[PDB]
Design a binder for this molecule. Structure first.
Ligand code: MG
Ligand code: ZN
Ligand code: ZN
Lengths: 222, 75, 154, 72, 162, 38, 45, 75, 96, 175
RNA sequence: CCCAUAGUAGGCCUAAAAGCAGCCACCAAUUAAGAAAGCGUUCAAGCUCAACACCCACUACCUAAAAAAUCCCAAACAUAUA
């Protein structure tokens, strides 16, 4: 015979109103008459806000930088609304509406004449930022499944993690970073300026510790 | 088949006596017993037997009458 | 660079696994086994035939018509009870699929005559009032005369 | 048009007189010790009964069914 | 060991089941605390593919092998023996461990091409016609990926792709 | 056969085999599930 | 305390010793003890 | 609905006339001969949007075939 | 043991098994009798039957089978397992 | 083998469900229907009951008559003809313990219960669970209480059926 | 590696949807099986899985490869000691 463990009871998680995701529009309620440059520092480096959870216990953890326009948000919201349970699951958006303007000139035009016209709008997303958060009274297999299904469709690398999974991954990351055999850490060489390496490196590498490069994220750099 | 069943329905509804003749017995697909069993089961007729072959596919030579016990050797 | 251990963990003797705590299912199984073994005096272990449930309910109704019951138990919970108690000579008879009979009062004639109708229902034997016997033992014991005359012949 | 519609015109007494209804004295007492509305959970049955283990097995079956929904 | 014996006598096939004798392990192991037959003799990362005596004790006379529940190997040690035995039947080793067949060894097609360290099957790999440029050259594999933790004496890692 | 990078079983009778350097998905009940590794 | 070796009846070679002891105890007299046995047997049944 | 007799059944269908171009051919080919059917006028129902666009395009081609379709197909 | 049901069991005539309950080498013949007396392998033909003979002083797990060709096959499972005798009976009933 | 079929007693016309299956099996259908009718003519009510048939390889069918279903008995004891779409928020009716006890003691003689050591507690628990899953509700033994219950339930169920028919007509009109 | 009976056609527009069209409660019998966890079903049949009975190896390091035009390019060695 085999043992029969008690099933996890779900009685402290109540589903609020509007379990489905809200509609995301293209341009905001007021257009920006001043054209802003394409500041690339909004996606380079670790994320500051929207890192931990808030209401749900499952969220998609980003592992790279990139821009998401109206089509990506529409695809994500449609997939969520078509692959969920409205009486047992509910998701809340974590990223704001796209507001960064992008200027595009005419096709087949000479170089010059100032900037072009504003077409669409995107939003900056850094590494380690939760894209969408979803909770409810379900378990972990199905939610991880239909969240990785969408994360594989995202341009940047993303995985479906939770609370315990994030805790375990942070624990093994710090365990690997505190038990290094070779005594030559990237941070020790970058901060103390060894062998004149500061000539070919970058001032942003002092805070990144060699864990970021442009927009990607290597979790095996240590 | 279908047309045979329709002709049978008409002939039985107007009461017409008839006798069955089997043609083309020179190919690799001669089996009067199967056709007779079909006429017995699938249709509502009666059993009968009047001729016996002496070789099929490529051995057809004559037929028997089994009424006078005297076969026929066609030449 | 991961730490390289001097001795691989798969080579050194692994520590013993912690024994699991016994659940209530096996406790209730052992309790009801002891209960049906103390009150009932006639049991007959027979090889369970992997037949359809239709014939199974048919034979169940044919047996229970003569005011008898039937109840089986898994070998995992039965072997300790057979090896720790007095029935230590019945442990080699529970090594596979089998069916145990729980019938109150001795009525071996009717059950044998109703089971011999099918030639695919064998039985390993059983005990008749603390007297272990086999199939041939049962078929030669069912031919014994009535109880009153055997009691009064002395 | 065929349908099994044999609803007898029962008012307030046709359900006890049409059939040989027996009083409460002739019926045994242990027939009223059954459940009524809500069923039985897991914290209302002692772990020394078959009903608790059957309920736990049913809950485990339900959990396995809810889990095995995406895998093949 | 155990073998099957079938005899024909008067249209009555007599299928018997006689159990024969078999040797055992030496009553003096160097490391009795080991959990694997290879670890108990201090042969951890100490054997190669040329050892025809070690590989012949865990295989079948007809070319087959033995599971882990019978031998006693773990997960990483059973795969090494499974890879080293495949490198022996191709290099001409173990001539008595050939599979049984009726009468198929009649037309000797391709002659006995000598080979060693054969990792993949001969009649299956595709000939490399392009070989790539220079930096991303497609080398030919050799050896075994599970035989990298063995003891070396040449002060250089085992080059498996050259 | 169909060229597929990620192979998977489409029903129940599909069994995976390793032949001529490629993983093939053969099936006798539903022959439409034949896949070929590219 | 377990049980017996579970013999069979197709090959009569062994018998329980208690039956033999009881028979040896009750089969060594004349007729007065037989009459007493009949009396004590008919007292109940 | 569906009726039936001793040997076969009798289906009660409800199919528009627009989808009755070659129904007899496929109905026979999917019945092995012994299948028949009867057709009679029933009522009217709203039209499907695909057939709506089809009849709109047909009326457009019949009236004036140069508003967009053949107007851009030729220039 | 579905191979015996997919193959066939029509030409067989009568089969039987003999073993002892108190022996420790009678599980093979026991599971063989259990598999041969299932549902598909028993309903695939109605012209055959089985005999379950249980003896005490047999001291031998012999299984004798025979089919319609007048042959005879007796296999004693003293040391053989269940799969071996199963595939042997399958091959013997398929080849003849 | 066996074929599960639940048809009406006095209404067993050759065709629906029991038609293509009986035609492809290899047995007759008109003779089976005639035998079922001549066996069920003893019933003076036409109660639909299940039928367990068995076919042998020599093409011959047998009929074993058993006990009818439970939903029909529950609907006859409650008084309603059709079941409700909800349970708890829309009760169809009330049935006392005496009616379900009589139904259980009458049904406990079929081929499923008479061939098993099942007591009265098990069958009354099963019928109580079936009544709870149907849409009705059981109660101790309420004489005058169930009288007043029926007196109010007639009116409330008439109102519920009227409003349900109105909602269905509205949904049919919105089309 | 094996294995599957029943209270039923659980409640309802559509003729019915009988385990996969929608609703709150998703009952209940012997050891043990979901008013339904994956295909074929106008309404029924055909197949597996979870649950007994039965033994009980790893029951899974997660996913990370590609083909253009004169012709592909040096060759070779996993085993005598940094
Ligand atoms: Mg079914
Ligand atoms: Zn080891
Ligand atoms: Zn397939």
């Amino acid at each position: 015979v085999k043992t029969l463990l008690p099933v996890p009871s779900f009685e402290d998680v109540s589903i609020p109103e509007k379990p489905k995701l809200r509609f995301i529009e293209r341009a905001p309620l007021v257009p920006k008459v001043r054209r802003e440059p394409k500041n690339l520092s909004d996606i380079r480096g670790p994320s500051t806000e929207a890192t931990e959870f808030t209401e749900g216990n499952f969220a998609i953890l980003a592992l790279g930088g990139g821009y998401l326009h109206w089509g990506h948000f529409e695809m994500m919201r449609l997939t969520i609304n078509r692959s969920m349970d409205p009486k047992n699951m509910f998701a809340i958006w974590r990223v704001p509406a796209p507001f960064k303007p992008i200027t595009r000139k005419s096709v087949g035009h000479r170089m010059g004449g100032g900037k072009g016209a504003i077409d669409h709008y995107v939003t900056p997303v850094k590494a380690g930022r939760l894209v969408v958060e979803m909770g409810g009274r379900c378990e972990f297999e199905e939610v991880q499944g239909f969240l990785d299904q969408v994360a594989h469709k995202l341009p940047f690398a993303a995985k479906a993690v939770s609370r315990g999974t994030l805790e375990k991954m942070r624990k093994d990351q710090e365990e690997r970073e505190r038990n290094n055999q070779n005594p030559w850490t990237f941070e020790r060489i970058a901060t103390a300026n060894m062998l004149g390496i500061r000539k070919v490196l970058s001032p942003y590498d002092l805070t990144h510790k060699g864990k970021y490069w442009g927009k990607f994220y290597m979790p095996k750099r240590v | 088949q279908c047309q045979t069943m329709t002709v049978n329905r008409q002939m039985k509804r107007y009461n017409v006596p008839f006798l069955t003749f089997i043609n083309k017995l020179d190919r690799m697909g001669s089996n009067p017993a199967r056709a007779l069993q079909q006429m017995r089961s699938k249709l509502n007729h009666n059993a009968a037997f009047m001729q016996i072959p002496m070789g099929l596919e490529g051995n057809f030579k004559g037929i028997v009458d089994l009424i006078e016990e005297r076969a026929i050797y066609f030449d | 660079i991961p730490p390289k251990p001097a001795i691989h963990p798969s080579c050194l003797p692994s520590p013993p696994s912690p024994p699991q705590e016994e659940i209530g299912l096996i406790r209730l199984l052992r309790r009801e086994i002891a209960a049906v073994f103390q009150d009932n005096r006639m049991i007959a272990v027979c090889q369970n035939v992997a037949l359809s449930a239709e014939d199974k309910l048919l034979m169940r109704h044919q047996l229970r018509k003569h005011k008898i019951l039937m109840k089986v138990f898994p070998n995992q919970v039965l072997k300790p009870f057979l090896e720790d108690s007095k029935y230590q000579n019945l442990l080699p008879l529970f090594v596979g699929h089998n069916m145990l009979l729980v019938s109150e009062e001795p009525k071996v004639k009717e059950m044998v005559r109703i089971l011999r109708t099918v030639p695919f229902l064998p039985l390993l034997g059983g005990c008749i009032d603390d007297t272990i016997l086999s199939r041939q033992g049962f078929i030669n014991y069912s031919k014994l005369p009535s109880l009153p005359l055997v009691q009064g012949e002395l | 048009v065929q349908l099994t519609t044999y609803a007898m015109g029962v008012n307030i007494y046709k359900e006890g007189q049409d059939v040989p209804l027996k009083p409460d004295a002739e019926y045994p007492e242990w027939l009223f010790e059954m459940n009524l509305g809500p069923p039985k959970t897991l914290e209302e049955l002692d772990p020394e009964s078959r009903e608790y283990w059957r309920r736990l097995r049913k809950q485990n079956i339900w959990r396995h069914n809810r889990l095995s929904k995406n895998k093949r | 060991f155990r073998e099957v014996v079938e005899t024909q006598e008067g249209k009555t096939t007599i299928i018997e089941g006689r159990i024969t004798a078999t040797p055992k392990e030496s009553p003096n192991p160097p490391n009795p605390s080991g959990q694997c037959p290879i670890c108990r003799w201090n042969l951890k990362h100490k054997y190669n593919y040329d050892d025809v005596l070690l590989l012949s004790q865990f295989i079948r006379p007809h070319g087959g092998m033995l599971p882990r529940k019978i031998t006693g190997l773990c997960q990483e040690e059973h795969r090494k023996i499974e890879e080293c035995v495949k490198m022996a039947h191709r290099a001409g080793l173990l001539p008595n461990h050939r599979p049984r067949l009726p009468e198929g060894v009649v037309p000797k097609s391709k002659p006995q091409l000598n080979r060693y360290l054969t990792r993949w099957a001969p009649g299956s790999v595709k000939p490399i016609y392009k070989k790539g440029p220079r930096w991303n050259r497609v080398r030919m594999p050799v050896g075994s990926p599970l035989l990298r933790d063995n003891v070396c004496y040449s002060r250089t890692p085992w080059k498996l792709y050259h | 056969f169909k060229n597929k990078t990620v192979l998977k079983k489409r029903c129940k009778d599909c069994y995976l085999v390793k032949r001529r350097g490629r993983w093939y998905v053969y099936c006798k009940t539903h022959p439409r599930h034949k896949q070929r590794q590219m | 305390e377990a049980l017996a070796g579970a013999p069979l009846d197709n090959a009569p070679k062994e018998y329980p010793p208690k039956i033999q002891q009881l028979v040896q105890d009750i089969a060594s007299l004349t007729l007065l003890e037989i009459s007493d046995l009949n009396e004590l047997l008919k007292k109940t049944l | 609905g569906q009726d039936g007799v001793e040997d076969y059944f009798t289906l009660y269908a409800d199919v528009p006339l627009n989808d009755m171009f070659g129904y007899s051919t496929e109905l026979r080919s999917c019945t092995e001969g012994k299948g028949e059917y009867t057709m009679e006028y029933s009522r009217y129902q709203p039209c499907l949007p695909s057939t709506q666009e089809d009849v709109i395009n047909k009326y457009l081609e019949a009236t004036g075939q140069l508003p967009v379709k053949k107007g851009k197909a030729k220039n | 043991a579905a191979a015996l049901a997919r193959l066939g069991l029509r030409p067989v005539k009568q089969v039987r098994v003999q073993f002892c309950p108190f022996e420790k080498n009678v599980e093979s013949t026991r599971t063989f009798l259990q598999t041969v007396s299932s549902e598909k392998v028993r309903s695939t033909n109605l012209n055959c039957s089985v005999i379950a003979d249980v003896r005490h002083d047999g001291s031998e797990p012999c299984v004798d089978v025979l089919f319609g060709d007048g042959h005879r096959l007796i296999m004693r499972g003293a040391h053989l397992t269940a799969l071996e005798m199963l595939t042997a009976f399958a091959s013997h009933i398929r080849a003849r | 083998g066996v074929i599960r079929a639940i048809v009406r007693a006095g209404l067993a016309m050759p065709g629906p469900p029991l038609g293509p299956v009986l035609g492809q099996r290899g047995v007759s259908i008109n003779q089976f229907c005639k035998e079922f009718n001549e066996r069920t003519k003893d019933i003076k009510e036409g109660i639909p009951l299940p039928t367990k048939i068995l076919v042998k390889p020599d093409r011959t069918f047998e009929i074993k008559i058993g006990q009818p279903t439970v939903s029909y008995f529950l609907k006859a004891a409650a008084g309603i003809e059709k079941g409700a779409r909800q349970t708890g928020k829309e009760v169809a009716g009330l049935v006392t313990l005496k009616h379900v006890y009589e139904i259980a003691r009458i049904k406990a003689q079929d081929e499923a219960f008479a061939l098993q050591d099942v007591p009265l507690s098990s069958v009354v628990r099963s019928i109580i669970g079936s009544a709870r899953s149907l849409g009705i509700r059981v109660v101790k033994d309420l004489s005058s209480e169930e009288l007043a219950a029926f007196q109010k339930e007639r009116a409330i169920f008439l109102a519920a059926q009227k409003e349900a028919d109105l909602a269905a007509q509205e949904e049919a009109a919105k089309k």
